[PDB]
Amino acid sequence: QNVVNHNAQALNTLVKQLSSNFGAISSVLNDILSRLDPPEAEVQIDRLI
Amino acid sequence: LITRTQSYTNSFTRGVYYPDKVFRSSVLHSTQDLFLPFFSNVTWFHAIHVNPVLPFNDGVYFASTEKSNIIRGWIFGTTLDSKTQSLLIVNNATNVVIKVCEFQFCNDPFLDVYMESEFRVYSSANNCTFEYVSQPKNLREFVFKNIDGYFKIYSKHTPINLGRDLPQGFSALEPLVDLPIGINITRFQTLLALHAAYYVGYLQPRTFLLKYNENGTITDAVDCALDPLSETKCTLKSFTVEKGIY
Amino acid sequence: VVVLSFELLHAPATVCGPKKSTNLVKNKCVNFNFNGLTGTGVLTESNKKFLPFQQFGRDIADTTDAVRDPQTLEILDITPCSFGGVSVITPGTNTSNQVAVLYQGVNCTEVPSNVFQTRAGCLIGAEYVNNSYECDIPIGAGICASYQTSQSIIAYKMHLGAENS
Amino acid sequence: QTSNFRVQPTESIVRFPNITNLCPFDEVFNATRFASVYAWNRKRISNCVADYSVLYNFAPFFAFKCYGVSPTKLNDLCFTNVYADSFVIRGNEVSQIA
Ligand SMILES: *[C@@H]1O[C@H](CO)[C@@H](O[C@@H]2O[C@H](CO)[C@@H](O)[C@H](O)[C@H]2NC(C)=O)[C@H](O)[C@H]1NC(C)=O
Numbered sequence A: 001q002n003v004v005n006h007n008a009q010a011l012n013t014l015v016k017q018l019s020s021n022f023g024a025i026s027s028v029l030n031d032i033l034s035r036l037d038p039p040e041a042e043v044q045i046d047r048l049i
Numbered sequence B: 001l002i003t004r005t006q007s008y009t010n011s012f013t014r015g016v017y018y019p020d021k022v023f024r025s026s027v028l029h030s031t032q033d034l035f036l037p038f039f040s041n042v043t044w045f046h047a048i049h050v051n052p053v054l055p056f057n058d059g060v061y062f063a064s065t066e067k068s069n070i071i072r073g074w075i076f077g078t079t080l081d082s083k084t085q086s087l088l089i090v091n092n093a094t095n096v097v098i099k100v101c102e103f104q105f106c107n108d109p110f111l112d113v114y115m116e117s118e119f120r121v122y123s124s125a126n127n128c129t130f131e132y133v134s135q136p137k138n139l140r141e142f143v144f145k146n147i148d149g150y151f152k153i154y155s156k157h158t159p160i161n162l163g164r165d166l167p168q169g170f171s172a173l174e175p176l177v178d179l180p181i182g183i184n185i186t187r188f189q190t191l192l193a194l195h196a197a198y199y200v201g202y203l204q205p206r207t208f209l210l211k212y213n214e215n216g217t218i219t220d221a222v223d224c225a226l227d228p229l230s231e232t233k234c235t236l237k238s239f240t241v242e243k244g245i246y
Numbered sequence C: 001v002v003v004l005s006f007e008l009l010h011a012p013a014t015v016c017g018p019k020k021s022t023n024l025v026k027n028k029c030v031n032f033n034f035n036g037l038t039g040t041g042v043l044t045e046s047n048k049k050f051l052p053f054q055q056f057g058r059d060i061a062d063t064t065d066a067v068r069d070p071q072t073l074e075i076l077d078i079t080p081c082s083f084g085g086v087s088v089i090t091p092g093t094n095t096s097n098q099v100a101v102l103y104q105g106v107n108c109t110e111v112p113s114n115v116f117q118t119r120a121g122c123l124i125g126a127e128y129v130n131n132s133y134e135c136d137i138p139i140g141a142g143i144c145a146s147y148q149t150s151q152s153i154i155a156y157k158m159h160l161g162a163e164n165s
Numbered sequence D: 001q002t003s004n005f006r007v008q009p010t011e012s013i014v015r016f017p018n019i020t021n022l023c024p025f026d027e028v029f030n031a032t033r034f035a036s037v038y039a040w041n042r043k044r045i046s047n048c049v050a051d052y053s054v055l056y057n058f059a060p061f062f063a064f065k066c067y068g069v070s071p072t073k074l075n076d077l078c079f080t081n082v083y084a085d086s087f088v089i090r091g092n093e094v095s096q097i098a
């Protein structure tokens, strides 16, 4: 059972980092595209990447 | 002429409300918000007619068990003067009216019944910004909060048995209304109708662990900062813990 | 003469213009915007029952999976659109230029000739015989493929070994 | 393993609640008599939905100029409140209102 649990846990962590700002304006990328100008959008995209 | 007397009593894990509008099914969820801490000391007021104002900070929990028609509403403000905006809520048998204006409130306001007149609540009204009208033993609980220019009210009505007020059990408060008023609240007062006892508590920042059943209703909660045992339940994200060291 | 003055003060914005809504379409992979909730997927009829004040539902992984329609107060299930890996099976260019294609984890009816449904996915370009052999090219869940007679790609079940008593 | 496959979307759907509780622009544009310049009127409009398209029924023909905004992208914006000042002047003083 232990082995199974470990694997499951890992997957959840990999999902949870998706919903994180990581020091950017927001976690959602489409909003950053819509609201912001190409100069300032690039740094946010690179930070998320 | 109304005289008020104070005593103290215990919360007994009351004041839980839905913090979101998200449906969840058979899940334990951890939230961080303004809550009334478990087993806290709340004030019991006895008003008799044969009354200074109260502070408002980070929201208020209000409870009553009167047989209605005595308590009608509340006054919220920061100076209760003509120079600042104030909010007023009055209930009758037919409707509810919420108004924000520049009132000149009287000391010790009350509704006069002979027709219900409001010449003993304020004297002048001046500029009015927002108005709203809607629909109107037993225990009635309300939670009042004010964040980012929105005034939120949650409510709940519960038929209680025995003779004890604030009984033991769990009951969550559904959202009642949200008002975009954008004013400042620091003090509040209760209104009476003349031809009363109530409970007051204060909210604090706190993290809670809530349990949702399969129908989407909150059935139980855990306060993290109460005991060492309740903190383990929140680190483990579970309501039961097995023997060991954590 | 009428003069209109627009003011953006520090308060919630309570004077907005109308927001028009289009029709509702189901059983298709579409982009959707439900009252500000933006996403994409397939919307199907739901059997869930929200509380009167709840607007959308989230999963244990904190992903939106149900939504309430703002005009007709029904519940809809949101489903992600199909995706998967594409693998190519060949006998080696020294033997033939024919190939078969595996679509991992999708039904053969989802917008993908000999077609066959396996546990691993949809197999296109192979013939499914019955009699078994030793495994040559593993596919998954006991299915293997080979180049046999004219000559063509065939799929079969793995054979463990000769029976003895 | 060579390629990746994903089905693409084919349509766009937007859903919002019903439109109701319209702002009272008709009262301002059509009334009994407009005020007298020195004593003009100011009406506060808030907590409603404003559609700046029904205006043309009440005859905005002689002049229609919009500083700071765009006559088309008006109902695409949100404001805390809007005021309407209406009066009567002579046909030669319109240029002075700017
Ligand atoms: C929004 O408007 C639509 C009509 O344009 C409403 O749909 C009708 O609602 C009435 C309610 O009395 C029903 O009797 C009709 O059968 C409905 N017709 C259709 C075509 O749906 C809709 O109810 C309105 N939205 C809300 C929240 O009431």
Ligand SMILES: *[C@@H]1O[C@H](CO)[C@@H](O)[C@H](O)[C@H]1NC(C)=O
Residues within 6 Å of the ligand: C128, C129, C130, C131
């Ligand atoms: C297995 O044999 C049966 C005959 O009983 C046949 O119907 C079936 O198609 C065979 N399976 C194959 C060819 O994959």
